[PDB]
Write a protein that binds this ligand. Structure first.
Ligand SMILES: C[C@H](CCC(=O)NCCC[N+](C)(C)CCCS(=O)(=O)[O-])[C@H]1CC[C@H]2[C@@H]3[C@H](O)C[C@@H]4C[C@H](O)CC[C@]4(C)[C@H]3C[C@H](O)[C@]12C
Ligand SMILES: Nc1ncnc2c1ncn2[C@@H]1O[C@H](COP(=O)(O)OP(=O)(O)O)[C@@H](O)[C@H]1O
Ligand SMILES: Nc1ncnc2c1ncn2[C@@H]1O[C@H](COP(=O)(O)OP(=O)(O)O)[C@@H](O)[C@H]1O
Ligand SMILES: [Mg+2]
Ligand SMILES: [Mg+2]
Ligand SMILES: [Mg+2]
Ligand SMILES: [Mg+2]
Lengths: 368, 367
């Protein structure tokens, strides 16, 4: 008989680990805080299969094997119940919220860069026997959550589709995008890579709202969207959300975010490189120029994906607080115009950039 | 459940199934011909017998789109590792025919159509991505992919135990081993083989996986099928046309060069028609998108062709086209050319503009 039952505060409060409050922001997932000493119980609500909870638990445990300091500990998980029992991180702040409040989080980019480099390297064919990796591909296939992304980041913003949500003051600029054949061709190629390039186990939703942060600590959460896809993807989505915060700031306040974009690519590239040297199984790994060309391709896709995330967050179904809370209204429109414009340039020009500072310097010029 | 068959128990299965003397005409796979006639193929246990599930499933899928270009499957069973199929012994394996000097005028149109349709119709272009992600699971082929990952993409390029080549070839083989830039390129193509889950491929589409006569073509043995790069079956087939060209002299080569041009042309035209007609992709009709898609397939196809050319010359698994060339010295010379053309194909793959450029490069090198 079926064993799933949607939890409540009492039901959540037998595993051998006095008061409980549901603190979930969304509505697809319940998050139960139990308090001593504290604990979190996350549970999927059923339209999206509850299978996502199996993916999420498994992804967190996997990430913990390589970067246990950058992810919450998982004490228990259950597939039928769609439950993940994990470490309480309420003493930290969601990074998107903190950044909007003016926190700079000096280590954010070192920490995320390390997370990206290790997670993305160690689940790849570089690191794993291909026969092992092919099994992990099966275990982490995520059709419904991939469908969300395939539509929202890669498809809907580029056409007059019903999921989009944007001010009419933006219509002229949005229609300029829709009519742009060559940027759309490129977004199709990026989407095709998303659909087909089973390179590693990615997080699949690594924006600033999926990170807990304080001055000295960083933790990545909510790998619901995990599956075998392109290595550049998590890197692009994260970098884009740094740029999205930049656009919500003015003048010299932007500098910390530009430094984070630079630092996260750099740390990613070092971390991925050191893991490659020390732990690759490939006979081809140590041939001069092979790692270099591999990183150049990741870099290029990462910038393309960033462009998609920049556009998608601005005019698509799922927005970001960074742009939506900008005041006054006319400034909001202007900054949302620029996210559209930079995202487009990112997509079009992705293979012309040589370094991360090329990308930052282009961005800075477009947002002057 | 599983029991390896013999000629007698193979006859018993045929009658038990309600269909219709027996000889095993196949070291890993038995093929039982039963005479109205019928074929019963069975996997033997080191390599998983799960390959027989993949082969039967692949043949049935291919039959949905090109039923005239694959044998009919009357019955299959996973636990017995059995595929019961149409008898094609009135046809000749294409490799054998081509070596005897048969030219098979329609071979390239038939395979071009096979390629275009099979490769389009199991892709994200043709299928709901949710459906396609299920087929990826179903066709995951770790052991047979491992053979390819090692034999076509890795061992030939290093001093590995599986390679098998004449000592007279050593200088040219060592030239390849010491070539960093071709090997970087071979790595990229391998990485694509390992990661690019674009469509359901045959995975072993050489001239010995084809039955042929003047008027008929049938593709067989899709044991190696899995979700991989679209360019792969195209490259491996083109390379085996070039391998036969090298076993011929002078003007007798021209039919093979025509086959290479024709198979790309037919492939490109079939894939294009299927794209216009049957794509699910909102991006499908934007001018330049199909064109750029084909350019990438072309480039990979040519790279994979170079790997197959090298691999068949000096790796574990050879081709009769090269190994039966006489005299010995001529053999060494032509095997040197396969190595050098395969190398050129890998390194120049993104410089070619059309199939004619590929052929004209090849013809120049083998003058
Ligand atoms: C002007 C600033 C220099 C900043 C600075 O010096 N601070 C920089 C550094 C990186 C440069 C771009 C990239 O190269 C890619 C691309 C190459 C084409 O060739 C020309 C266009 C484009 C967009 C470049 C223009 C320009 O040159 C950029 C924005
Ligand atoms: N481990 C945790 N510790 C403390 N709070 C958490 C924890 N996990 C989630 N939360 C709270 O619940 C919110 C929703 O978490 P998240 O995993 O992103 O759910 P969803 O998938 O619904 O977005 C977070 O923004 C955070 O405020
Ligand atoms: N459908 C068939 N009709 C007639 N002969 C066949 C048929 N299938 C296979 N054979 C014979 O058996 C041989 C091996 O078949 P194949 O499917 O290539 O097995 P393997 O996977 O061992 O290469 C073929 O070359 C052919 O001579
Ligand atoms: Mg979240
Ligand atoms: Mg989530
Ligand atoms: Mg065979
Ligand atoms: Mg076979």
């Amino acid at each position: 008989t079926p064993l799933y039952e949607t939890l409540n505060e009492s039901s959540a409060v037998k595993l051998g680990l006095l008061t409980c409050q549901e603190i979930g922001d969304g509505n697809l997932n319940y998050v139960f805080h139990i308090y001593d000493r504290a604990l979190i119980i996350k549970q999927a609500v059923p339209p999206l299969t509850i299978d996502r909870a199996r993916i999420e638990s498994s992804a967190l445990i996997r990430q913990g094997e390589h970067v246990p300091h950058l992810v919450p500990r998982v004490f228990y998980s259950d597939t039928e119940m769609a439950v993940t029992v994990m470490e309480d991180l309420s003493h930290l702040k969601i990074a998107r919220k903190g950044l909007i409040e003016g926190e700079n989080y000096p280590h954010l980019s070192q920490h995320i860069g390390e997370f990206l480099g290790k997670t993305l390297f160690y689940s790849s064919d570089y690191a794993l026997e291909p026969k092992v990796k092919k099994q992990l591909v099966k275990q982490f296939t995520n059709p419904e959550l991939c469908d969300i992304t395939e539509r929202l980041v890669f498809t809907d913003p580029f056409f007059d589709h019903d999921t989009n949500d944007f001010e009419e003051e933006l219509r002229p600029f949005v229609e300029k995008l829709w009519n742009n054949d060559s940027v759309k061709i490129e977004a199709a190629k990026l989407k095709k890579s998303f659909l087909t390039s089973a390179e590693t186990l990615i997080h699949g939703d690594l924006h600033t709202g999926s990170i807990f942060a304080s001055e000295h600590e960083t933790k990545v959460i909510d790998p619901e969207f995990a599956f075998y896809g392109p290595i550049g993807f998590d890197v692009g989505q994260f970098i884009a959300n740094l740029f999205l915060n930049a656009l919500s700031r003015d003048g010299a306040d932007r500098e910390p975010l530009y430094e984070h974009v630079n630092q996260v690519w750099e740390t990613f590239e070092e971390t991925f490189s050191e893991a490659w040297q020390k732990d690759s199984l490939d006979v081809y790994a140590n041939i001069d120029g092979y790692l270099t060309d591999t990183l150049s391709h990741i870099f290029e896709e990462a910038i393309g994906f960033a462009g998609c995330e920049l556009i998608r967050r601005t005019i698509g179904l799922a927005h970001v607080a960074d742009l939506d809370t900008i005041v006054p209204f006319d400034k909001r429109i202007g900054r949302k115009r620029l996210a559209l414009e930079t995202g487009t340039a990112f997509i079009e020009k992705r293979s012309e950039f040589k370094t991360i500072t090329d990308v930052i310097e282009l961005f800075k010029l477009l947002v002057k």
